């Protein structure tokens, strides 16, 4: 077959493809650019390249841990399970090197992804090739075959000891697969959606901890490699501590201890570096370790300063309220009422509701405000018998207000400018020469003055912690010009009060 | 009786209940949902659940300190005061496990608190049950009864030593009460109002210090437990230091030292971990300790950057003023006057007075501005003989201005746009062809040009550090259309000057 | 005399007095409230209390360094120069205790400073009295006189050794003068103007370094005091190190080393605390030292993040410009021109010129803008022959614009909306059917279309990096209604071009 | 010749000269102020002073490394290659001292650069002269000639040992060239354009690392100098460690270790400072090292908090969206749609497009918006047949909107206020009593209601993730008054629908 593997090479339809391209037709035009780019070409957003590069991450983390251990702590390991492990690993890192000449390269300077196989070839050779070519081919296994052709007797003389010390240096060229480890994680963590939705301070602090553990692991093997290459001199940490003929569990464990002590800021065990090699390795690990630890405090600080923001923003605003009250020296009763205001108005979290609504689409501002005001719509007798466009056009105009008990919301004998809807609590309409009356959750007041452009006719005073909704004059005249049929309903209720008045 | 205990199960009336629900009637509807939820059901905001969970915090902090000490440092403690201490403690952690099936669960996805006892049951079993069931029942005391039924002779053989080493591992299942310690502090610190009013950087840094001391205490017992379970091998820190047969005061004290050295970044006393157990415990404590210490620097930095904000905001603004003056290379006399401006205008603290007033309710902006301008109202002869709505409608329009001596506030022969009230100091009305005259604290100028829409008639020049109040034209015409009776008083005073002119 | 000392008790006239009170008359009313408050009363802002509390800072820093040294490191020092040093010091700390009942107390809840001597007395006894009464009287010298009356033979028995160990504990009550050290620095650093003008991050980091050196000095004496009070046990750091009979230079030096090692995160010299006293002192100093060091990183971070702000603000804005250009994938030539824009428009520092001007007084916006545009005023032939109010009313309207070479500033055949003044460089007026002409620094263009409300008549194209000034139509019509005499001058020049046209 | 060297003394024409002065003529006036300032005067921005001060940076870094090494670790080095190295170095630091009296001094208080050679002379002597005069002349080589004249026999007695210990103290006066190292880097890093374009957090952290390595290098020589000047006492670190007669490779290496341990927070190798000199040097290096390390954490934190800003700003906004949705307890379907909104509207990066465009010049807003809308212009049939000023005046008015599928963009029977252009996807015009029809990328809807000022005539419902462009009424009436010829084209298309209707 030739069809079913072409579906893996071209970017399929999911959420990511849509996000990258817009409509589904833009993906369908992209899926035809893959097939028209030549035979057997890989698109980088496709499902093959995502699940190929996932298996290479599970192979590099295998070979960046097992390789620097099996070179040092085993003084001769050329058994069958080890060489097969290196040949199988060298197979995938050649196939990965082959498939990089067929993968499209994302250019951050144009809107196109290059799928011409020659332009892919000329960009890969210039930027990351030799680091991915040295780490691909088995360099150590070539050199033993080449030195076999150079000299047949290179296994008997005193040169043979130098070659084996030269061989383990060449097999550390396979640690250049960190360059493919780093690139295939930055490309993975953006595409993978659960890491794309995490905060960037959480993502970078995981990449650091994965790097601090890996550098401490390589350093732990390097504290044992450099004395081992020097045939364990009589001043090296390994000799004095008498760790030449222990198991490879302890050697590595003690070496990891020394590296972690040098890095994490602790002091080594009274073995003041006494040999030049040891002094310069410890000074290497002290500088490397204290730099990675100071970058760990930098990420941990940036993570903490973006944990709990709204509350921070509520308290930073209220601290400016507190210092404003002491600058003008308010009485402590008015300081108590203003502190009773913010925890009843804002309830501990301060959002900027105007911008959060305004960035959204209209069809979503109509949906949120129709959800936030369901306790007002279902309780009022006005809104259950109205046009649903009228209800949505009303609720977008309102603004939320809080009045403490004892406050005069409307003073009689002023010019009216707002209309009030009662969400919570009861108020007291105080009438000149008549009995006071209460209004409940769902009654509305402040409409007589807006229909006549006159002055206020009665006092309104809060009794509970009333949470009201305000409607200005300019919005009230604008809504009725759209819907003149709902104008007469307010004229009916305003006829009733002026009757009672 | 059955009545008086029902008053503890339902949420009573206080500030917290009102804050959570709004009006008192919303609490009264909530108190009937408790009684209609079945027999003997606990509401989580009620006064029983607050003072039950306060006693459990005073019991868990007892049992998360005494239990990890009395297991390790006492090689056999099955006396009467110890077992009674564990049976009494296991009674409350079963009753706490029973009462969790009757407490309402706060859902952060709906507006309702579930009080149906079956839906409480099906949520508690899924999230935090087995951690609260293992830590509830005495697991170690069951296993001795079970092993008694398995083998009657399990106290004489060499298996008996293995069982006692197996017994102390099971009694460390009681350290899972940290999961109930953490949950019952987050629920406590939000309800308790003196911790709800503290900053979140102060709250999280207390929870960290309580956790750093507890982890250092468990680590201090763990440095002694793991050698004790291994029958004190001849390489363990305890042997070399010769601390096998000291008092349990020293054993614990020396162990706490070792843990604090490993954590707080210091180095241990020349005892380079020489036994695998000791190497991996020290490496455990170095990673745990340096992570908690780096999080301590992160909270201490976030606390310091939100200590003194206004002044920070005054100085960050004035540093932008300083660099603006050096960018344009002002003369040093004008740099001196502008530095004399900010400390007389702002006095070292810079508030944003417009937003701090604007977030409040109108009945509070009328109360603050009527307090801030009492020195202006009581000193002017205008305001003591006026309507109190007129005084409040005037004072909401004014804006605060500062003029240094020598400055010309009003130049003669321009178009007038503002009116001035004198709070502090004296000015000099310079008249074309007449003698200069002074105006004092409470006189007002700049009203002749607003009544006639003409041009300026005289010069006004500052003599002291005058703090004035400004009133624009558009506000001045608006206030007089409300109150035309106060229009004639300004016409009387403007008749006097033009007479003197 | 009784007059000349009254001038020290009342707050004199300087910059600070004026800043605290406003006009000089407000100081003169304050100077009469001092004299009318009773006989011999101290005002806290006066020149006596400033220079009294300056000498006490130079005495407390003497006695918080010399006292904790001379108690410990001298096993018996009751010589004449030592006791005279303590009696002279105890004289000033009684007089300072007497003068605190006559100093006015600043209340942060009212606008008044209390000068009633009874209300001063009732506030001082409640808040800071016993800490200033214990540290005032010589407590150790009383106890030797009292024990002389208790038992005449208290110098011969074995009780006499216990009394001398009890005596040095009582003389450490004089370290409560830190409470007067801290209060008299917070009151000093606000009044002293060179510390009031420093940043608060610079002030708090100096108070910390003064506290870290003092805590390390007390800790250095405490590492030697507690073994000295225990008669130097055979496990104490002093014995093992063999420092019992050295000079008091070394004892103190070695002790300061140990304290600094425990605090600054280093490890002590192989002397793992081997005595309970030593373990709990080292654990005391490790917690105290690592807490003060973590607060040092917190202040050093907050200092660095407010060093270089404008440039930070220029680069944080331009980084948003850089990521905006790569998000839309601009060509690299347009990326080069936009990078050439910001360094010619903003020149590396980005100020918010609108708010920095707007917070100032008008008489200062008239003075700065008349300084920033002196190269425009002196070079134009228009402004040197005009009214100085007209020049100031023109320059407040202008806005600053930058055009790169090749740009078309004005395209012929559009509706004109702005007028241009040339500060730097030359432009090319391209005329339909006529020869191009240049305009120099001080010529102006874009006024023909504003006098006729017609359309554009010619093209204008930049040749150099022109820095222009823009004047809108609405401002241009407004200025000419004030000054109609300068309207005809632009009509003359517009007559010339239309002649040449 | 005298001409060709004058071209190096005067500031040439490049980007920096233009940035500092404006137009090229302003440079040409500056190049004549150099020649008119006297004979042979150096302008500080010129190409001679840039490449002179670059060679001195490559000489000071030579002599601040080689000098503190060759003094200490060589107990007598007066060979020919050493003295020639000091005489050649003392030649350039005299010529650099001579050329500082001819270089113009930048004054941060005026707009002029002083080129009068007397005012250059009187400013250099007051600020940085004696530090540049002591470090210039060979002070040690004078003192041997002077002491030769004082006493001819000063080489034989016991005074001769004191003179050689006095000689190495005088040759450390050459470390005052750090004052010329610091000044010539701040002047270099501003002029050099690749360091002027880096962030200031990146620049200051490189200057710190260059200072931390240099202070650790001087400290490493100071740990060996002070015992060497004291003839290696029997308690000094050098003796006990037995490092008196090793090579100068080890001496220096071991000393650098000790300094780095004291600074980087590690502990020294069991050599608890046992000699007063050693105690006070270690305490010197602990305070110096922990201060430079705490400043390293401060810069590393400030670097991390300005790495990835836009995404931070996208996520900090969306976290406020997340907490707003849980505060009002939205259903999880509406939480899913709003999360589908932001990643389709903003695509993970949130720019403030209004301010980023508004700070630019008009000729650049015309160029960017003509680039961002090329997919709209080339696809619509309207824009390919229009005036290019009309296309640019249209595209500056549009605003970008996103509608999810199922949303009703336009509801039939409302008042029309906007016009829509389709960039991506298809919509469904739902017609009362007629068949639905689709519109594609480049068709436009919402123009019938704007030409008649009537109400909406049909429903429009989204089908894909439509990215639209909005055009308001007030902008639509304004553009047609400029171009009435394009008014009739929309009237033609609106005639077609009302025909189909
Ligand atoms: N007699 C009354 N009974 C009930 N409500 C009243 C009475 N008089 C006034 N009101 C309400 O008080 C409001 C004050 O503002 P309006 O006059 O605009 O509208 C008025 C009514 O809503
Ligand atoms: N019959 C129709 N066929 C196509 N488009 C239509 C039809 N009726 C209305 N429209 C479009 O729907 C738009 C709704 O707003 P307008 O009436 O302003 O302009 C209208 C046209 O763009």
- Alpha-carbon distance of C143 to C156, in angstroms, equals 17
The burial class, CB within 10 Å (0-12 / 13-18 / 19+), for C419 is buried
CB D331 within 8 A of CB D290: no
Q: Which atom of ligand 2 sits closest to the CA of residue D448?
A: 18
Q: Does B315 touch chain C (CB under 8 A)?
A: yes
Whether B365 is in a domain gets the answer no
Radius of gyration of chain B (CA): 38
Neighbours of A146 (CB within 10 A): 9
Domain boundary among A197, A212, A247: A197
Question: Which residues make Cβ contacts (< 8 Å) with residue C212, sequence separation at least 6?
Answer: C292, C293, C296
CB B3 within 8 A of CB B32: no
Q: Which atom of ligand 1 sits closest to the CA of residue A434?
A: 1
Please give the backbone phi and psi of residue C69, each rounded to the nearest 5 degrees, phi first. -90, -45
Distance from the alpha carbon of residue B368 to the mean position of ligand 1, in angstroms: 28
- Alpha-carbon distance of B221 to B216, in angstroms, equals 9
**Sign of the CA dihedral A232, A234, A240, A245?**
positive
Q: Which helix (H) or strand (E) holds A467?
A: strand A466-472
Tell me the three state secondary structure of residue A3.
coil
A172 secondary structure, DSSP code: G
Whether D365 is in a domain gets the answer no
Lookup: tokens for A269: 């065990």
- Alpha-carbon distance of D41 to D104, in angstroms, equals 8
Q: Which helix (H) or strand (E) holds B122?
A: helix B117-127
Whether A355 is in a domain gets the answer no
In a 13 Å sphere around the CA of B242, the CA atoms on its Cβ side amount to 1
| Complete DSSP assignment for A457-490 | -SEEEE-S-EEEEEEEHHHHHHHHHH-GGGHHHH
| Three-state SS sequence of C419-438 | EEEEEECCEEEECCCCCCEE
- C267 and A265 within 8 Å at the Cβ level: the answer is no
Q: Are strands A427-430 and A437-439 parallel, antiparallel or unpaired?
A: antiparallel
Please give the backbone phi and psi of residue B430, each rounded to the nearest 5 degrees, phi first. -90, 120
Question: Which residues make Cβ contacts (< 8 Å) with residue A29, sequence separation at least 6?
Answer: none
Nearest 10 degrees: Cα torsion B461, B465, B467, B472: 30
Neighbours of A59 (CB within 10 A): 17
CB A118 within 8 A of CB A101: no
Whether D362 is in a domain gets the answer no
Q: Which helix (H) or strand (E) holds B445?
A: strand B444-445
Produce one character per residue of A401-425: b if its CB has 16 or more CB atoms within 10 Å, e if not: bbbbeebebbbeeeebebbbbbbbb
Provide the terminal-to-terminal Cα distance of chain B, rounded to the nearest Å. Answer: 91
Which of C18, C273, C364 has the CB atom closest to B341's CB atom?
A: C364
| Complete DSSP assignment for C29-45 | HHHHHHHTT-SS-B-TT
CB B45 within 8 A of CB B17: yes
- Maximum CA pair distance of chain B? 124
Lookup: tokens for B42: 């606990």
Lookup: tokens for C458: 């010619």
Q: Are A252 and A219 contained in the same domain?
A: yes
Lookup: tokens for A325: 């009250």
- Alpha-carbon distance of C235 to C154, in angstroms, equals 31
Q: Which helix (H) or strand (E) holds A399?
A: strand A399-403
Helix, strand, coil share (%) of chain C residues, nearest 5: 60, 10, 30
Q: Which atom of ligand 2 sits closest to the CA of residue D434?
A: 1
In a 13 Å sphere around the CA of B445, the CA atoms on its Cβ side amount to 25
CA D162 to chain centroid, in Å, comes to 51
- Alpha-carbon distance of D319 to D313, in angstroms, equals 10
- D329 and B111 within 8 Å at the Cβ level: the answer is yes
Lookup: tokens for C461: 């194209």
User: Would you mind telling me the total number of residues written for chain B in this entry?
Assistant: 501
CA D396 to chain centroid, in Å, comes to 33
A328 secondary structure, DSSP code: T
Could you tell me the strand order of the sheet in which B459-462 lies?
B408-410, B459-462, B427-430, B437-439
Q: Are strands D418-424 and A459-462 parallel, antiparallel or unpaired?
A: unpaired
Produce one character per residue of C105-143: b if its CB has 16 or more CB atoms within 10 Å, e if not: eeeeeeeebbbebeebeeebeeeebeebeebbebbbbeb
Domain boundary among C168, C197, C226: C197
Q: Which atom of ligand 2 sits closest to the CA of residue D456?
A: 17
Helix C362-372 / helix B332-345 crossing angle, nearest 10 deg: 150
CB C416 within 8 A of CB C446: yes
| Three-state SS sequence of A13-49 | CCHHHHHHHCCHHHHHHHHHHHHCCCCCCECCCCHHH
Provide the terminal-to-terminal Cα distance of chain A, rounded to the nearest Å. Answer: 91
- Alpha-carbon distance of C422 to C376, in angstroms, equals 8
Could you tell me the strand order of the sheet in which C459-462 lies?
C408-410, C459-462, C427-430, C437-439
Question: Which residues make Cβ contacts (< 8 Å) with residue A319, sequence separation at least 6?
Answer: B306, B309
Q: Does C111 touch chain A (CB under 8 A)?
A: yes
Start-end of H helices in D265-382: 276-304, 309-327, 332-345, 353-358, 362-372, 374-377
- Alpha-carbon distance of B172 to B166, in angstroms, equals 11
Q: Are A229 and A280 contained in the same domain?
A: yes
């171009």: which residue's tokens? D483
CATH number of the domain residue C442 falls in: 2.60.120.10
- Alpha-carbon distance of C88 to D124, in angstroms, equals 50
D38 secondary structure, DSSP code: -
C-alpha closest to that of A416 among A471, A464, A368: A471
Whether A354 is in a domain gets the answer no
Distance from the alpha carbon of residue A447 to the mean position of ligand 1, in angstroms: 7
Question: Which residues make Cβ contacts (< 8 Å) with residue A302, sequence separation at least 6?
Answer: A201, D301, D304, D305
B155 secondary structure, DSSP code: S
Q: Are C301 and C328 contained in the same domain?
A: no
Check pocket membership of D414 for ligand 2, CB cut-off 6 A.
Answer: no
Q: What angle do CA D385, D388, D389 make, to 5 degrees?
A: 130
Residues 147-176 of chain B whose Cβ lies under 8 A from any Cβ of chain C: none
Q: What is the resolution of this structure in A?
A: 3.3
- Alpha-carbon distance of D295 to C305, in angstroms, equals 12
| Three-state SS sequence of D225-274 | HHHHHCCCCCCCHHHHCCCCCCCHHHHHHHHHHHHHHHHHCCCCCCCCCC
- Alpha-carbon distance of D391 to D374, in angstroms, equals 11
- Alpha-carbon distance of B131 to A475, in angstroms, equals 58
Cα B390 to Cα B396, B472, B480: the distances in Å are 10, 16, 10
Helix, strand, coil share (%) of chain A residues, nearest 5: 60, 10, 30
Strand partners, D183: none
Q: Does A310 touch chain D (CB under 8 A)?
A: yes
Chain A to chain D, count of Cβ pairs less than 8 Å apart?
137
Residues of chain D neighbouring C338 (CB-CB closer than 8 A): 360, 364
Lookup: tokens for C239: 């014995």
CB D8 within 8 A of CB D37: no
Q: Are B230 and B96 contained in the same domain?
A: no
Produce one character per residue of C251-278: b if its CB has 16 or more CB atoms within 10 Å, e if not: bbbbbbbbbbbbbbbbbbbebbbebebb
- Alpha-carbon distance of A460 to A439, in angstroms, equals 10
| Complete DSSP assignment for C45-83 | TSHHHHHHHHHHHHHHHHHTTSHHHHHHS-SS---HHHH
CB D315 within 8 A of CB A200: yes
| Three-state SS sequence of A314-326 | HHHHHHHHHHHHH
Q: Are A70 and A186 contained in the same domain?
A: yes
CB C328 within 8 A of CB D212: no
Residues 322-351 of chain A whose Cβ lies under 8 A from any Cβ of chain D: 349, 351
- Alpha-carbon distance of A403 to A468, in angstroms, equals 8
- D19 and C254 within 8 Å at the Cβ level: the answer is no
CB B132 within 8 A of CB B180: yes
Check pocket membership of D459 for ligand 2, CB cut-off 6 A.
Answer: no
- Alpha-carbon distance of B357 to B372, in angstroms, equals 12
Q: Does D271 touch chain A (CB under 8 A)?
A: yes
Neighbours of C313 (CB within 10 A): 15
Q: Are A146 and A204 contained in the same domain?
A: no
Cα D26 to Cα A226, B411, C247: the distances in Å are 63, 39, 72
- Alpha-carbon distance of B293 to B264, in angstroms, equals 7
Q: Are C134 and C185 contained in the same domain?
A: yes
- Alpha-carbon distance of A184 to A189, in angstroms, equals 9
CB A34 within 8 A of CB A9: yes
- Alpha-carbon distance of D373 to D379, in angstroms, equals 10
Q: Does A312 touch chain B (CB under 8 A)?
A: yes
Whether D143 is in a domain gets the answer yes
CB D25 within 8 A of CB D45: no
Lookup: tokens for D258: 């000790």
Whether B94 is in a domain gets the answer yes
CA distance D109 to chain B (A): 6
Provide the terminal-to-terminal Cα distance of chain D, rounded to the nearest Å. Answer: 91
Neighbours of D438 (CB within 10 A): 10
- Alpha-carbon distance of A203 to A16, in angstroms, equals 19
- Alpha-carbon distance of D395 to D387, in angstroms, equals 13
Q: Are A149 and A42 contained in the same domain?
A: yes
- D261 and A273 within 8 Å at the Cβ level: the answer is no
CB B187 within 8 A of CB B53: yes
- Alpha-carbon distance of B230 to B442, in angstroms, equals 89
Tell me the three state secondary structure of residue A476.
helix
Check pocket membership of A457 for ligand 1, CB cut-off 6 A.
Answer: yes
Q: Which residue in chain A has the smallest CA separation from C302?
A: A301
Domain boundary among A283, A306, A329: A306
């205790």: which residue's tokens? C97
Question: Which residues make Cβ contacts (< 8 Å) with residue C189, sequence separation at least 6?
Answer: C195, C196, C203
Helices (H) and strands (E) in chain B, counts: 25, 10
Q: Are D278 and D336 contained in the same domain?
A: no
CB A320 within 8 A of CB B309: yes
Distance from the alpha carbon of residue A357 to the mean position of ligand 2, in angstroms: 28
Lookup: tokens for C375: 């190269």
CA distance B266 to chain A (A): 6
- Alpha-carbon distance of B394 to B476, in angstroms, equals 9
**Sign of the CA dihedral D60, D63, D66, D68?**
negative
- Alpha-carbon distance of C347 to B144, in angstroms, equals 81
- Alpha-carbon distance of A486 to A479, in angstroms, equals 9
- Alpha-carbon distance of A205 to A208, in angstroms, equals 5
Q: Are A132 and A156 contained in the same domain?
A: yes
Count of structural domains within chain B: 4
Question: Which residues make Cβ contacts (< 8 Å) with residue B103, sequence separation at least 6?
Answer: B42, B43, B44, B49, B120
| Three-state SS sequence of B483-497 | CHHHHHHHHHHHHHH
Whether A369 is in a domain gets the answer no
Helices (H) and strands (E) in chain C, counts: 25, 10
- Alpha-carbon distance of A49 to A99, in angstroms, equals 9
Residues of chain D neighbouring B332 (CB-CB closer than 8 A): 109
Produce one character per residue of B208-231: b if its CB has 16 or more CB atoms within 10 Å, e if not: beeebebbbbbbbbbbbbebbeee
Lookup: tokens for C118: 């009874």
| Domain span holding position A337 | 309-345
CA B375 to chain centroid, in Å, comes to 36
Q: Are B19 and B151 contained in the same domain?
A: yes
Q: Are D330 and D382 contained in the same domain?
A: no
Q: Does B106 touch chain A (CB under 8 A)?
A: no
C-alpha closest to that of B275 among B230, B225, B244: B230
| Complete DSSP assignment for A114-155 | E--HHHHHHHHHHHSSHHHHHTTS-HHHHHHHHHHHH-S--S
- Alpha-carbon distance of D359 to D365, in angstroms, equals 9
Neighbours of A354 (CB within 10 A): 9
Strand partners, C444: C421
Tell me the three state secondary structure of residue A424.
strand
CB B430 within 8 A of CB B460: yes
Q: Where are the beta strands (DSSP E) in D31-138?
A: 105-106, 113-114
Residues of chain B neighbouring D109 (CB-CB closer than 8 A): 326, 329, 332
Question: Which residues make Cβ contacts (< 8 Å) with residue A159, sequence separation at least 6?
Answer: none
CB D184 within 8 A of CB D56: yes
């Amino acid at each position: 077959m030739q069809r079913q593997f072409g579906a893996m090479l071209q970017p399929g339809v999911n959420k990511f493809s849509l996000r990258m391209f817009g409509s589904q037709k833009a993906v369908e035009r992209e899926q035809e650019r893959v097939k028209s780019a030549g035979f057997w070409i890989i698109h980088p957003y496709s499902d093959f390249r995502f699940y190929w590069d996932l298996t290479m991450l599970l192979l590099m983390v295998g070979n960046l841990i097992i390789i620097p251990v099996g070179i040092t702590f085993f003084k001769d390991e050329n058994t069958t399970p080890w060489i097969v492990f290196n040949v199988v690993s060298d197979t995938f890192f050649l196939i990965d090197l082959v498939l990089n000449f067929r993968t499209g390269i994302v250019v951050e300077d144009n809107t196109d992804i290059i799928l011409d196989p020659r332009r892919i070839k000329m960009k890969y050779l210039k930027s990351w090739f030799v680091v991915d070519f040295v780490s691909s081919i088995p360099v150590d296994y070539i050199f033993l075959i080449v030195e076999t052709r150079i000299d047949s007797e290179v296994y008997k003389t005193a040169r043979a000891l130098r070659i084996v010390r030269f061989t383990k240096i060449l097999s550390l060229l396979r640690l250049l697969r960190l360059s493919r480890l780093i690139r295939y994680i930055h490309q993975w963590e953006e595409i993978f959606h659960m890491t794309y939705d995490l905060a960037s301070a959480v993502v970078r602090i995981v990449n650091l901890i994965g790097m601090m553990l890996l550098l401490c692991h390589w350093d732990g093997c390097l504290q044992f490699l450099v004395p081992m290459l020097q045939d364990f001199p009589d001043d090296c940490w390994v000799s004095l501590n008498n760790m030449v003929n222990n198991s490879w569990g302890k050697q590595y464990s003690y070496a990891l201890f020394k590296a972690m002590s040098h890095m994490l800021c602790i002091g080594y065990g009274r073995q003041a570096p006494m040999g030049m090699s040891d002094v310069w390795l410890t000074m290497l690990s002290m500088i490397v370790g204290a730099t990675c630890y100071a970058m760990f405090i930098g990420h941990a600080t940036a993570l903490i300063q973006s944990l709990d923001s709204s509350r921070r923003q509520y308290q930073e605003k209220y601290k400016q309220v507190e210092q404003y009250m002491s600058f003008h020296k308010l009485p402590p009763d008015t300081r108590q009422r203003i502190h009773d205001y913010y925890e009843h108005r804002y309830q501990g979290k301060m959002f900027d509701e105007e911008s959060i609504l305004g960035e959204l689409s209209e069809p979503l501002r109509e949906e949120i405000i129709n959800f936030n005001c369901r306790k007002l719509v279902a309780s009022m007798p006005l809104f259950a018998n109205a046009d649903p466009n009228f209800v949505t056009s009303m609720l977008t105009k309102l603004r939320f207000e809080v009045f403490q008990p004892g406050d005069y919301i409307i003073r009689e004998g002023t010019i009216g400018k707002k209309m009030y809807f009662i969400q919570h609590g009861v108020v007291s309409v105080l009438t000149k020469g008549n009995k006071e009356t209460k209004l409940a959750d769902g009654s509305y007041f402040g409409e007589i003055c807006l229909l006549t452009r006159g002055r206020r006719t009665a006092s309104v005073r809060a009794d509970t912690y009333c949470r009201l909704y305000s409607l200005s004059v300019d919005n009230f005249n604008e809504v009725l010009e759209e819907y003149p049929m709902m104008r007469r309903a307010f004229e009916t209720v305003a006829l009733d009060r002026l009757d009672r008045i």
